[PDB]
Amino acid sequence: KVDEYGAKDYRLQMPLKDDHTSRPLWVAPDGHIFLEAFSPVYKYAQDFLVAIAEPVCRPTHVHEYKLTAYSLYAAVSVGLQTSDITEYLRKLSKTGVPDGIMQFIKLCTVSYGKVKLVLKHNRYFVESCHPDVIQHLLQDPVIRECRLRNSEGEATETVSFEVKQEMIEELQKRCIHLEYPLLAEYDFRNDSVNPDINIDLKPTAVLRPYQEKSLRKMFGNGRARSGVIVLPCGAGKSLVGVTAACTVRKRCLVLGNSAVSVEQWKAQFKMWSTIDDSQICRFTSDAKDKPIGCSVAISTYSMLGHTTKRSWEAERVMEWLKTQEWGLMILDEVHTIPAKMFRRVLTIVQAHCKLGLTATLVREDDKIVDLNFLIGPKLYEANWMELQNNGYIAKVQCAEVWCPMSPEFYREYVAIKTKKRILLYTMNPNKFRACQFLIKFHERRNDKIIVFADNVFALKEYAIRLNKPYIYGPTSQGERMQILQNFKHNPKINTIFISKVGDTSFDLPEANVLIQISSHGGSRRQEAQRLGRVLRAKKGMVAEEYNAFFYSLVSQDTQEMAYSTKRQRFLVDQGYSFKVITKLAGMEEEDLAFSTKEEQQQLLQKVLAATDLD
């Protein structure tokens, strides 16, 4: 029922009980659950809701989580039944639990853990203790096409059956339509087909409490289970992956976006894992190692997804991989998987346990529901503000700096309606002066300055005018590494311009000042990921609540405002606040570029010279 004010009148279906202060939870029948962080029972309720509910908003006081069938299946995979969860909700719900919510839980829980998929001898078997449901599944024509049949066309016959590998993904979508999700249970200790690997954990490795908690959530009943884990950048995600690989100790495959990530993973395994270097191989197009004896492999999506003809050695590597049975596979930046080519890689590789690690999951193409069956439910996602309080991560100080557009630029901004309009507001002379002032301020403050600019031309123009290193499309790898190492150590270099390549193509040296000038157009996940990757915990400023500094230069009254607001949606959902600043104190005293009008007019000439073709 809907009130005239737009609020849904839930008073009738939520009978309140007098245990107000003791019970901290509100259970709306829409599926949303509200928790008060100031309650003395916050920690227990937080831990309980993490397993059972998907977080939505985590601000300072009132947190909102959501209930999904995927969340319920994940909780079941943890090992929690319906009765205990319902009792705990009742002991914490301020009002009566709606029956429809209760009915929804009843419907989901019963159907969980019914259908199991097992990979043995390069054959996928669907089994269940209830052949009635199994026989029912035989009715589906899509299942009939997916179910492996004889070479004569005849379908094959605790009863199970082999399934076509190339038809697995379409079957997975059908399981949701059949309301019988697959059970990704792995014989963590009962495996005998795949021999172990002499890889252990070096004593220098330390698992933070949230890291160990997430690992224990993943390893239900001591058995590895495929899933998705969300860790903020700089929280030792690579350490967590190495730890999980050492724990499973079976055949381990890792996938990264670029060869730089591959090298980072190899260094991490050398830093923490006890596996011999000879058993570590990278399937890279430049550094090639034989797949033989490669206990743990690190590769990239493009190498495996190279649909065009590859090198003959690559053919041998692919054949060895297909022959090899993978107990464990590791995927990074899971938000990239929903692409068709990278999705095909999952079909290509035969792996038992597939774990995905990433910092964000808000795909602007909303291709995440199907991702729940590509890998599994989201196992864990840490509270960023909580890690800020715990000191694990730097407490970011975020600002939105409004730079008014020059009227001549603004008149031309209105004049252009096409994609060329981007260059108009991305090249604001007032924005340039503000950036110059901020750079001077932070250099006098002796801070590492990272200037993010998606537009190549704008980035090069800014860097050349300010006489600073710039990173762009080609970015020859030797020069890139040279500039990075100069930035890390040379005190003369503390201002680096990085184009869109800085998101995932390479590791970003730790900095404290991150200035964003150019936007993708609303990539709320990409820019947030890049921000989290840029800024990490810094010693010395641990006590202060603002040890990391981020500033977004936004052109006022432009379409950049809407993009910035849409982009910061996720970060606000993460509890991060953005203060709006218009007037920058100290700019008038300092002398900056484009002080005279014709200088800005000359810049306008230069930008307009770059027409729509550029």
């Binding site: 007019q601 306008l604 000439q605 307009l608 010279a609 027409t611």
Partner: protein, 85 residues
């Protein structure tokens, strides 16, 4: 020769140690004399195309430079018409 499907083997005439390892030194390609005259005339004609393939590519660039040049003045001209005294 690959276009004409004629056997073509590089003539290894020496070996160079540059780069810390001995490396093959090749002196052209040895092709059977019977096809040699047939192979030569095409090759020159092949070159007769490739050089032209170069020239056009240069001109196609140069034409754009005109579009790059004059238009750059035009806006500079147009701006002078919109803010000139």
């Amino acid at each position: 020769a690959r276009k004409l499907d004629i056997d073509c083997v590089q003539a290894i005439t020496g070996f160079d140690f540059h780069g810390g390892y001995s490396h093959p030194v090749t002196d052209g390609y040895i092709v059977c004399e019977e096809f040699k005259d047939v192979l030569l005339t095409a090759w020159e004609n092949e070159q007769a195309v490739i050089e032209r393939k170069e020239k056009e590519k240069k001109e196609k660039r140069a034409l754009g430079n005109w579009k790059l040049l004059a238009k750059g003045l035009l806006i500079r001209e147009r701006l002078k018409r919109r803010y000139g005294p």
